[PDB]
Write a structure and sequence with these properties.
part of a larger assembly, 4 chains, A mainly beta (133), B alpha+beta (388), C alpha+beta (57), D little secondary structure (14), A: mainly beta, two-stranded antiparallel ribbon, 2 helices, 9% helix, D: 14 residues, 0% strand, rod-shaped, RNA-binding, ribosome
RNA sequence: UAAUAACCGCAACAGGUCUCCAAGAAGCAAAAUCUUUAGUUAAAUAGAAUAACGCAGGUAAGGGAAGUCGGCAACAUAGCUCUGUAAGUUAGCAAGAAAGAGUAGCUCUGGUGAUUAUCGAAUCAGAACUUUAAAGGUUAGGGG
RNA sequence: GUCAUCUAAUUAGUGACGCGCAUGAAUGGAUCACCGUGAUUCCCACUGUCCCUAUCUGCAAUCUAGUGAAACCACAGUCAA
RNA sequence: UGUCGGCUCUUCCUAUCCAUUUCAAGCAGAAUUGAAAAAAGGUAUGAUUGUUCACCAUUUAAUAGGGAACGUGAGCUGGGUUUAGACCGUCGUGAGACAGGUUAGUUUUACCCUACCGUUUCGGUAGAUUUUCAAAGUAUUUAGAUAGUAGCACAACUCAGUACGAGAGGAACCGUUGUGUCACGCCACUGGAUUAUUCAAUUAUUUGAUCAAAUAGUGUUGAGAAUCUAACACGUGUUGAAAUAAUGGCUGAAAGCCUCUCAAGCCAGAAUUUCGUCUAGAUGAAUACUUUGUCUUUUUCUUGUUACUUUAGUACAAUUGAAAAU
RNA sequence: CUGUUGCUUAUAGACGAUGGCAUCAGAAAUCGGUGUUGUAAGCUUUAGAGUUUCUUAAUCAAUACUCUCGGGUAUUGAAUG
RNA sequence: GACCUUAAAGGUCACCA
């Protein structure tokens, strides 16, 4: 469901990295299991940056979301990444929103800023984002 | 048995053995293939790396998602004062490769060129080219020169001009020149020698050799590092912390029964002073004539290419220079052998027009804030000194 | 751009932007300014800041 | 089965 | 002499061998750290350069055991005061459970006596102001 | 072993079932409060264990002046078949 | 002859999992299935187990199978197995046994030869005599027998909801733009280390106090230039010609017809080969200067080389050796 | 010619090697540029919460104002003269 | 698999590495 390409965004989120859920779906935190499109290497852990659709499990939330495997998109990250126009930028916390394969967000609202890279990749996230940074 | 999991080998077998070069200058292994349907022209030059800075360039490629306000890219500065052509040599194609037939030199030769032929100049008698210069206008010696010109026109295929730098125009402490042979690509050998003869004793500026937005190949010697271990030289995996006798080494150096260590294993040794050729490097600014400054069509303030406080470990650039996109092999003050591309790049990015919007000239030490010292004083204002 | 703590003019292609969860984003000129900002230090009480020099004289 | 080890000391009384 | 050179270990061996006397700071403390009286500056050689690989001591962006047989190693908690403290239980404990807050400097205020107005003790509590917001130099529990 | 639970995933742990190769009552049976430089599993916190390596210091190693051993040694020391 | 597995690393096989090129299908499209050329390049992350093996959860273009003393312990580890302590079950009268289970159990030496990786020193290639020449010494500019070899893969836009198909569904070639990895580099911007014990602050002790320090083997904390460096920053490897393999064909006999040829002769066709390009490199060549012009041997000076010095000997211009192709 | 030697020499480096200069050589200060930290020491702002001695004089006082965009450091592997 | 016993069925052994 993603539209277009994404430039180089350094991936600061690993396997077993706990992020927050900015949705209103009753899931609090997710831990990344593996990253869609990740090209494997020996002893390398899967890596995710902004706008990267990951496969994550919810270890904290309401019972219909806990102890299950969902699909999310990283909207912000604490790792410092550089834009193509010489802008160096980083957020306050790692957050994600639950989307399906077709790319529509399960929730209805997003809390906090949403990075441009994830907003342009997924048109559904940008519509429900408060601000795009 | 088979290795449990597969992974690419560490290090390239194309650069084996890793032997450090002996001379700072790097000789180009080849020149662009000659075409006989064009005017004679030089196919190379030589400059000294001054440093690096960054620029903001306006994107001219269409059908791209790059920002419309510019893209931040690095640029390497190569100061290239004019060369002096002090001779030429003709090469003949035999059944064992090119063979230099004769070399014809000019009447007047600079002491920078003469210093190459000694090893202790301060003790030498400095009688280089003395007999050649003194008897240059003799009737016998002149006749010999005409034969050399006619021999090349008859039994030669490749003509190169022996050009040497003028080290008095650069902040380097070295006084001995740097000599480079620049092949002449163009018309027939008849008009190639005529072009070479015209260039004798003259000066060739880099603007005549290279154009604008032209991708070139650069050959230079990298930055030395000395004896280095396996981790740095090749990039093997560091061993677990529990390991006896050390962590930064290759655990297994071969199986039992090839009975010998293979050349393909990663062994500790010398990393550093190697010769490397990098192709398809774009010229961003041809710093000759009017473009010798650092101003742009958008930023109109007048400033030179040298950052405040001079280039680190180099000095001040006041001659012609080239702005090359990205990185080239070698530290500051290194000698770089430029060359026209052997395989001309035909990609859309190669033919893209370069329009600079801002060239950074802040100090390359610390976290600088100002572009010129005049605007540093204006912002800061008068201080305790100067006002007292 | 102007630094959030020091108030200096940020040179192009220099500095880091920081975004908080309250939709407010700041840009700084170096790690010296950014560290002071995260320690809740008032630029008015820091002698070298451009904020301080405007307040006094 | 096959074991493995060793050590000793003394080295006469020179 | 009575021991990092006089004793026992092949020796001027980082091992071992019973006792007496015992200053200041700081602190609950014969603790760590620094100093006075006394002792010594030599105790199996040094100088230059500052490669790899080491032994000893360290730090590190983002992630946080995904490494591994296994949180091995290291990180982390750490003093004192006040609030608070569960299941279980041999009813004694668990318990410093767990968890939270305070702590600096300076200028002051008050309580605790002796002797019959003068003299004296470190201890506790409280209040304004200031700053780089305070056990942490050293010493100093990870918890369930 | 079968059923639950712990995990995204459990030859591990825990709670149950029991025709138990070959449990069982001073060869002591069942039970655990406090205790343990005992064996095992799971959480929180923390981190170079790891992604993936970078870098700093002292002492060596390197070179030199003086001094100066030992293990080992049929003869020796380039490969393929 | 140190006996399992794992970790690290290199190479080799093809009975090939992916990528490339083809043929066949009960191949309409998509997804597939069988086979040929081809081994140059890739082939992952975790829960449980010491495990090899296995079974699950993911991801990927694919997560193929194997060898090298069942590769690899003076490479690591010591989980298992496999001494000596201890416990249980069964067996034995007993000492004790158990491919029955559990727990704790020292992993020594390279300074030798070679191999490999780097790095020095000395030696050096035979047949030209147009003095505008020939040779030796020193130095630069070049040269290139040989050896290695490097770039791969994926995604998005358009093609296009088009071809095909009743519908459901549903492509590809050119072109454009990015990402990941590998290799080579590099210090501008971003980040990290920091004994410039830089600047500042501050706890304890000592200088009578202030200043200024010292001590706590770098007291500690904040910022911190330089240098080094990123899996954390960023550049290049989008690159050109010819011949090919499997296969598809052209002309065309054998064999009056047919036939791509177990015939002669050609064309198209691969992540293929060779040029071209990159790295190391042998005998070499040109030029500058110093010489010598029939020649060396043995001594001898120099750090070393050439020229050079002395005593003798030797030769002295003049008929050699070319068709090519079939 | 070449090597040693010197620049406690660098674009180099374990040692050799490699690269540059060697009297228009070299080295060193100082000065300017350029960076880093954060406003030196001495005296002055009822500064200043309050205290004491006076009897509106002083004294003590964390911290704080002006001189002060100050002071200090800056090649050691930075750039000029 | 080997030994034994019953009217196919059982029972004991199957060890050191």
């Amino acid at each position: 469901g993603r539209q277009g390409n994404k430039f180089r965004v350094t991936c600061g989120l690993n396997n077993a990295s706990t992020v927050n859920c900015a949705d209103n779906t009753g899931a609090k935190t997710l831990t990344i299991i593996s990253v869609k499109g990740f090209h494997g290497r020996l002893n390398r852990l899967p890596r995710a940056g902004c706008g990267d659709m990951v496969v994550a499990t919810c270890k904290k939330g309401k019972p219909e979301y806990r102890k299950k495997m969902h699909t999310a998109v990283i909207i912000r990250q604490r790792r410092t990444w550089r834009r193509k126009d010489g802008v160096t930028l980083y957020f306050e916390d790692n957050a994600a929103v639950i989307v399906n394969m077709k790319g529509e967000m399960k929730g209805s609202a997003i809390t906090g800023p949403v990075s441009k890279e994830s907003a342009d990749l997924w048109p559904k996230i940008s519509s429900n984002a408060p601000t795009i940074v | 048995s088979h290795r449990k999991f597969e992974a690419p080998r560490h290090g390239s077998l194309a650069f084996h053995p890793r032997k450090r070069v002996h001379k700072v200058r790097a000789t180009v292994s080849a020149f662009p293939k000659d075409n006989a349907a064009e005017k004679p022209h030089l196919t190379g030059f030589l400059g000294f790396k001054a440093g690096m800075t960054h620029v903001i360039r306006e994107v001219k490629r269409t059908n791209t998602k790059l920002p419309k306000d510019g893209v931040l890219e690095p640029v390497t500065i190569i100061e290239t004062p004019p060369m002096v052509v002090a001779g030429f040599v003709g090469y003949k194609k035999t059944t064992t490769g090119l063979k230099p037939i004769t070399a014809v030199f000019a009447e007047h030769i600079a002491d920078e060129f003469k210093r190459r032929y000694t090893k202790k100049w301060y003790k030498n008698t400095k009688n280089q080219f003395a007999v050649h210069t003194e008897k240059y206008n003799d009737v016998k010696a002149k006749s010999k020169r005409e034969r050399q010109i006619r021999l090349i026109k008859n039994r030669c295929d490749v003509v190169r001009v022996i050009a040497h730098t003028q080290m008095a125009l650069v902040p380097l402490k070295q006084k001995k020149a740097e000599v480079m042979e620049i092949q002449i690509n163009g018309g027939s050998i008849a008009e190639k020698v005529d072009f070479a003869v015209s260039l004798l004793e003259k000066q060739i500026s880099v603007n005549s050799v290279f154009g604008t937005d032209e991708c070139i190949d650069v050959c230079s010697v990298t930055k030395g590092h000395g004896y280095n271990g396996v981790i740095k030289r090749f990039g093997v995996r560091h061993l677990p912390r529990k390991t006896h006798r050390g962590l930064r080494k290759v655990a297994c150096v071969g199986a039992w029964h090839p009975a010998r260590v293979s050349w393909t294993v990663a062994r500790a040794g010398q990393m550093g002073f190697f010769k490397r050729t990098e192709v398809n490097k774009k010229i961003y600014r041809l710093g000759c004539g009017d473009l010798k400054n650092a101003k742009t069509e958008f930023d109109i303030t007048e400033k030179g290419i040298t950052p405040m406080g001079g280039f680190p470990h180099y000095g001040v650039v006041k001659n012609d220079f080239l702005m090359i996109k990205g990185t080239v092999a070698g530290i500051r003050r290194r000698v770089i052998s430029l060359r026209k591309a052997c395989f001309p790049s035909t990609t859309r990015t190669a033919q893209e027009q370069i329009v600079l919007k801002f060239i950074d000239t802040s100090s390359k030490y610390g976290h600088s804030r100002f572009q010129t010292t005049t605007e540093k004083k204006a912002r800061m204002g008068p201080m305790k000194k100067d006002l007292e | 751009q102007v630094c959030a703590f020091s108030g200096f003019k940020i040179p192009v292609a220099k500095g880091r932007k920081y975004v908080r969860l309250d939709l407010k984003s700041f840009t700084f000129i170096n790690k010296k300014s950014l560290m002071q900002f995260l320690r809740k230090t008032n630029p008015r009480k820091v002698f070298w800041t451009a904020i301080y020099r405007q307040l006094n004289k | 089965x096959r074991x493995x080890x060793x050590x000793x000391x003394x080295x006469x009384x020179x």
